[PDB]
Structure 1
């Protein structure tokens, strides 16, 4: 049949600010850092770490993802 699973934005005569990481002053600081650091024997299958108007669209159709 009909299937619509989409990120559907439609702007008309509009003003839009979004997804904006803004630093004005930093000193000896760690500011807005997407990171993964220290993994040992880890098993991640679908782990999207997304930020600042980023996007991650995964369309698996009759698609196996087999880790053994």
Structure 2
């Protein structure tokens, strides 16, 4: 059949600001940090950590992710 599973984004005579992480002043601070830190014996199969207009597209067709 006909399948459209996509990100469709069209702009016409437009103005768009987006996905901006803006620090003006920082001191002894941890600001906007994407992190994973301290894992032990963990089993993660589809965990996309995403931020600030970044993109993660996964198209599995008849595929097999096996973590045995």
- What TM-score results when the alignment is normalised by the length of structure 2? 0.99
Structure 1 residues 9-67: Cα deviation after superposition (integer angstroms, max 9, x where no partner): 00000000000000000000000000000000001001000000000000000000010
Q: What are the ranges of 5 or more consecutive residues in structure 1 without an aligned counterpart?
A: none
Paired residue secondary structure (2:45): strand
Cα distance in 1 for partners of 2:7, 2:28 equals 38
After superposition, the CA RMSD in angstroms is 0.3
Q: What are the ranges of 5 or more consecutive residues in structure 2 without an aligned counterpart?
A: none
After the TM superposition, which parts of structure 1 deviate over 2 Å for at least 4 consecutive aligned residues? none
